[PDB]
Design a protein around this ligand. Structure first.
Ligand SMILES: CC(C)N1CCO[C@@H](C(=O)N[C@@](C)(C(=O)Nc2cncc3ccccc23)c2ccc(Cl)c(Cl)c2)C1
Lengths: 296, 301
């Protein structure tokens, strides 16, 4: 029993964090094999990059300075070729995630990991993270068996306090640029499939007060969900929620009628899993993983 | 900007997780130097649990009865001793991944990270607090026994908790790394219920200061209060008494924000009376009590 916001064990990623300094700027880098990946703003970017030489980039892995032997740019990420391959390089992949998907963030300052938290790619492509100056280059990941899938690299904080970044191939999530200009996060929406998964986690944990005898059509639910700035629920989401529906005996459209009532009437002084708001940062897979105990 | 429930990087603890099997029971152990620490109930059967005589059960065990597995390598047990409710299994190999560590016993209200493990394999990390009733609101399934709670301070891991059991309400009970249980709990399947839980007042105040540091001032008011009047109100909402130690501990945050502790106490009194009126504080509709004054300072600066 118990439902916590749980991050993946960060160990395989900690062994990859390095500090990258160029000029007056110090930020974090991800050392995988003989390459260090970091935000290109550490330095027209190709014009500024041409002016740089290998020895301008100081890379520090703990108390050992790594020597840069090459540099290239891929979209908004700078790839610093180093002479030493990271012996702690885990089995990894670079994956691009979709909005609504969750991942763990290993927040780092000066190439030193300081915290790990779980978060979701918001539908507006920002992440509601926890970062301070020096956190740039901190990464987002998921762990599947023994494979670390790197999905995010922190690049900036938007004026509202939310964060924007790229996948490990340097492509930004969202309509952002790594430049000094007026940029704002779009209006955010609630990740509907995630709230439903969290309602199933609540049922698995013995919280049934919000359940009702009613069901709804997918279309009537979407008409209501659109009113409360909830993401449309697709047939794929309904299919993805299948296992939780089978385990609890509550059909997805049955749980949708519960969600509809919660949106129209509120919680009435009641909580669900210790929360007075509907939580949307647990995917259906996170709920199954935490209410089954999959290990890494 | 931003305020998240943040756990410590779990790497230094992952390299210490081992699987301990005794008969039909399999749970987690903490391999530090040449010793594996685990709950002593690993020697019990489900029947033995009502009234186990641990010394009687342990005297009947030999080293080879304990199977210890570190990844895909079986460790050889060369000795065993019991210290309170923890079993210490001496092994023939020192863990090369042993970090700089200490065993610390924490007080209620203190927070720590939990590396939840099953079969000696870490599956997740979360942050939580020692509740005033000495339980932890964790996320544990069967096989998580021996999962540890820790803090990391200057490359040093301070182990403060080892998971032992789940109480009937869904909350968890366990010991420090010297085998002493937190609270009045025993590693016996007897009628044990967690006492009525209260809100960690000093932590809610710290979280209100984190909100002010992050630009959220809507809940502040022109009032101040005496420490005694605040405690009389706080008791009525099942909030822990705020001591002069708590007021002193909140000093740095009071100096940084310019809001005196008793001034913030008056805001808390008003929040308790009014509720949030559809508003949130740091993305939360409830008053958060699992961030200590030390966590707020570490995360916001
Ligand atoms: C009902 C009874 C016939 N049996 C069925 C088989 O499992 C028995 C059981 O609960 N075992 C543990 C290991 C336990 O509670 N550990 C766990 C730790 N964390 C989360 C848990 C979530 C679900 C289940 C167990 C959890 C136990 C039991 C009694 C004591 Cl006194 C102690 Cl110290 C530890 C209860």
């Amino acid at each position: 029993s118990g439902f916590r916001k749980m991050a993946f064990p960060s160990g395989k990623v900690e062994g990859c964090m390095v500090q990258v300094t160029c000029g007056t700027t110090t930020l974090n880098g991800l050392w995988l094999d003989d390459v260090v990946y970091c935000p290109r703003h550490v330095i027209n970017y190709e014009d500024l990059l041409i002016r740089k030489s290998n020895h301008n980039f100081l890379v520090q892995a703990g108390n050992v300075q790594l020597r840069v032997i090459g540099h290239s740019m891929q979209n908004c990420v700078l790839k610093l070729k180093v002479d030493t391959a990271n012996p702690k390089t885990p089995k990894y992949k670079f994956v691009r995630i979709q909005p609504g998907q969750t991942f763990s963030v290993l927040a780092c300052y000066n190439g030193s990991p300081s915290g790990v938290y779980q978060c979701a790619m918001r539908p507006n492509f920002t992440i509601k993270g926890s970062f301070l100056n020096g956190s740039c280059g901190s990464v987002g990941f998921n762990i599947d068996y023994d494979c670390v899938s790197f999905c995010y690299m922190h690049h900036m904080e938007l004026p509202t306090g939310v964060h924007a970044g790229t996948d490990l191939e340097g492509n930004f999530y969202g309509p952002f640029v790594d430049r000094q200009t007026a940029q704002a996060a779009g209006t955010d929406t609630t990740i509907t499939v995630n709230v439903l998964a969290w309602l199933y986690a609540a049922v698995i944990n013995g919280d049934r007060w919000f359940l009702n005898r009613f069901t709804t059509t997918l279309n009537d639910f979407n008409l209501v969900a659109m009113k409360y700035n909830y993401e449309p629920l697709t047939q794929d989401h309904v299919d993805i929620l299948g296992p939780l529906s089978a385990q609890t005996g509550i059909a997805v459209l049955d749980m949708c009628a519960s969600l509809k009532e919660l949106l129209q009437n509120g919680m009435n002084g009641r909580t669900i899993l210790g929360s007075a708001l509907l939580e949307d940062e647990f995917t259906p897979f996170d709920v199954v993983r935490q209410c089954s105990g999959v290990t890494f």
